[PDB]
Amino acid sequence: GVVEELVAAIGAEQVVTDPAVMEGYSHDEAEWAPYDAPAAVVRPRDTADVAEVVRICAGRGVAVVGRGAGTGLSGAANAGRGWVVVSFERMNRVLEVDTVQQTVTVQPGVVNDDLRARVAQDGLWYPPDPASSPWSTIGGNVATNAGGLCCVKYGVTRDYVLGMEAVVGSGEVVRLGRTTAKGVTGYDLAGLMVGSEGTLGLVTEVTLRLVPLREHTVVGYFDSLTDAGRAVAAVSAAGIVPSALELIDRFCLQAVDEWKGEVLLLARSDLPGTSGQEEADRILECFEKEKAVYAVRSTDEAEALFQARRLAYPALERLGPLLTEDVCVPKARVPHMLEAIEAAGERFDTRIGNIAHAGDGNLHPLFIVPAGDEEAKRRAKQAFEVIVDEALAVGGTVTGEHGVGLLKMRGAADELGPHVLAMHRAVKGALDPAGIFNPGKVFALE
Amino acid sequence: GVVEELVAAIGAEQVVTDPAVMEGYSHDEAEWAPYDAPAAVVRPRDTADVAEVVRICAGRGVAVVGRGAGTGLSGAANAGRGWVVVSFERMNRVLEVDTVQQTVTVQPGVVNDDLRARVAQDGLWYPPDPASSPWSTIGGNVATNAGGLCCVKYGVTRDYVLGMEAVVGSGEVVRLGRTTAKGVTGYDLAGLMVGSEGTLGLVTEVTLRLVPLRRGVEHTVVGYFDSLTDAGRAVAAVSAAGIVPSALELIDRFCLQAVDEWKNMEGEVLLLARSDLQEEADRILECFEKEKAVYAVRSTDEAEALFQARRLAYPALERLGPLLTEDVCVPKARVPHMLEAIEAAGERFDTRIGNIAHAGDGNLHPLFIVPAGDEEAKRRAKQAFEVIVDEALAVGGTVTGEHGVGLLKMRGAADELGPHVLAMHRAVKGALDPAGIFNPGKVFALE
Ligand SMILES: Cc1cc2nc3c(=O)[nH]c(=O)nc-3n(C[C@H](O)[C@H](O)[C@H](O)COP(=O)(O)OP(=O)(O)OC[C@H]3O[C@@H](n4cnc5c(N)ncnc54)[C@H](O)[C@@H]3O)c2cc1C
Ligand SMILES: Cc1cc2nc3c(=O)[nH]c(=O)nc-3n(C[C@H](O)[C@H](O)[C@H](O)COP(=O)(O)OP(=O)(O)OC[C@H]3O[C@@H](n4cnc5c(N)ncnc54)[C@H](O)[C@@H]3O)c2cc1C
Ligand SMILES: [Fe+3]
Ligand SMILES: [Fe+3]
């Protein structure tokens, strides 16, 4: 009967309990991730309301799962029987853009693009652009440490989180991190909150640092995954850093070309003036010493090839359920990793489509399961399970940006090992003594 | 005995007990920071030996304080009576330079420059260049989260720690962080170890990210001023008028004519600037002639000696007596107000405080030199730097920007963090160090 206490705690129009308005709030876009009907879905208005839902929930042992827009692919925001889904959709204001400090102060509910458009008016820029930029929230991007296409040279969300206001413990509002451009005082707790996937506390206000408002595409029509890619084991080994570098295959494109060589490799270079034309002709030398049917300098605003890469996951989702994996391996092991994905596609008769942020060795293998073809659905799980077990042996990690959540919990336990898992339970026990903040995700308590 | 177990595990040429050969291992350069003779100073050879020192001391409640080169300015490496000083001076090798991944894998004892010179051979660059680059270690810079001079565009040491190998708890050797260029698996535990000042475990290996060695545009900008008050509106204007510089420092003549009594190589405020792009290179002048300036030459030649003077400013003064240094960092828009307040606090406590500052990001270094014979001047200066810390907190800054909390800034940091954050600090250290052996009583005070 936690709902009666919540409505007496934070009004009656903040707490929603209708089970029909909850099926959309109890899961993200991760399919086969066990979710259930929660007890209540709270829509807090300010930090005080979150400080009450955490306080009510800490005295009862009721689980609290934060939720932004529910666009995760690992089930990180999925609810359980009796949980409380704190929806930050009402805290969606940008509270400041310090133009001289080059920082912005945002609430966890502001959408990624809504933030980028706002800071653009003041000549500042927020680099991290995850392929879900028009939908994901800053509160979600901070807890998952989401990365984008420009992470090659600009970094992930952690590279811009300066400080934050969180609700931790039994409901204490604390200020974490610095607000300046330098500061070592204490521990790096504001950083520990990044990538924690909401299992240590709810962020109710985030800072973030900005950069001034910083164009050459590269293109390359190639064939197999064994080759083609190998220009990524060469661009990093030979030619500088491309402002972007993706790896999408024709298999995903002719599913975007229906919804309004063989495997391409786009690259970018954003340098003003003559410094900048050479990055676009420096990023070519790697592309023709490797088969190369076409490969044209290009750079003709076309750009149409990068919207296709962004709409790679917005496609193949209305064509059936989509299972996605997200491994990140060393850049020198991308050629074999593409070999293992295509070889795992025949060991389990499943034709795995490949998209990848090739600029840092982060691959997104993806297979589309026919809502009627069963065995390809069950070989793919085993096929996507050998991919993670292979990416771990080459020296990579089970996830590169999407987070652990639920679907990558086992494989992640193998990477961290028994000793690191012991520290995870110890850390969460200190900052979440009641065990209410998204329990059983990333690691399993017990 | 307690030394008997150290000698029984790996104690032949690793364990030293001579009290004369331990004072150089039991304290750093922080003046008036309580240090004392430890019980033993271990100089481990590999990660396994550290796992033995932690295992012995965890079962006995004996404190362990890590040591790199002992160049801290906050007493972060100071030992206590009966502690064990783990000296990483024997782990001073770079064990890898991944050229395709653009990473380096180094041991905690490697000197900061020793790392950059090594990676320079392969056309790669390690940006963070702290003013103690010829002496401090990478293991120390990771534990302190040290920053450099051209950091105002590339970031601090934390911005380059990818993964690490640490000895945590009762002695388990663990791998923290990734080695690739992406990875969110688990918590950012390797990051929690960065900037922890060795109070959660000893780092025995850190992986670091590198950047290509671009050259060409080393446009510098000099320009002596008249006062510290009017070298405000010109540091807050280089950012508001557009685009931050590759570097921007602010040193005064008292430190310059303290370097000139050595390598005999103008005004009262130098303020150097940099630009690595090229336009703008005449635009960072406009902040200097719109405000008062005795001089200002966009000089691209060598001009470059003045930066060795800025770097060697604390390597200077080091010969003029004991030096009390502070390290506050305030918002960039509040540097002008801070420089007025410190110089005004120099007469409210008539101690003439010399000023160096990373004015490009708001990190100020007020410093006073103690005559060492005037006793009250020890207490006149102490309170003068105390109102400076209390002013940086009320203005919206932090008690430390790069030097770390350590010992000398514990009272000020406790006021900034507050009771709730301090409670989380003890809870974390209690969880990862249940025995309380990893540098106890630093950064925060255990109840
Ligand atoms: C088409 C498409 C493309 C995508 N491309 C990318 C990509 O390139 N890179 C990438 O990283 N991701 C991508 N994503 C998914 C991405 O991981 C999520 O969108 C993002 O990580 C967070 O989104 P959210 O906030 O909407 O998620 P949610 O599922 O709502 O939750 C995010 C997590 O944070 C927690 N949480 C939310 N708010 C708070 C708070 N204040 N405090 C603490 N915890 C909180 C939740 O517990 C949850 O674990 C993509 C998704 C889609 C559909
Ligand atoms: C002239 C001068 C200029 C300086 N400039 C800067 C600057 O620009 N920026 C800046 O940040 N600092 C600067 N410093 C001080 C600087 O913090 C230290 O030089 C450096 O951060 C620590 O290096 P170290 O190994 O010498 O530290 P130590 O004196 O050994 O102590 C460092 C701290 O980290 C711990 N530690 C050491 N090794 C390890 C390990 N392997 N694992 C865990 N903990 C460990 C110690 O316990 C101690 O608490 C300067 C100092 C001087 C004298
Ligand atoms: Fe992605
Ligand atoms: Fe400094």
Residue numbers in the entry:
A (entry chain A): 3 to 216, 220 to 265, 273 to 313, 316 to 460
B (entry chain B): 3 to 267, 272 to 283, 289 to 313, 316 to 460
Publication text:
The crystal structure of the enzyme was solved both in the absence or presence of D-lactate (PdG-D-LDH–lactate), revealing a Cα root-mean-square deviation (RMSD) of 0.46 Å between the two structures. The structure contains a non-covalently bound FAD at the active site. The active site located at the interface of the FAD- and substrate-binding domains is connected to the solvent by a cavity with a volume of 314.6 Å3 and an area of 490.5 Å2. The substrate-binding domain binds an Fe(II) ion coordinated by strictly conserved residues: two histidines (H371, H378) and one glutamate (E415). The iron ion forms a hydrogen bond with the FAD O4 atom. The B-factor values of the substrate-binding domains are higher (36–126 Å2) than those of the other domains (25–85 Å2), indicating greater flexibility, which may play a role in binding substrates, product release, and catalysis. Unlike many other members of the VAO/PCMH family, the FAD cofactor is not covalently attached to the enzyme, as it was released upon chemical treatment with SDS.
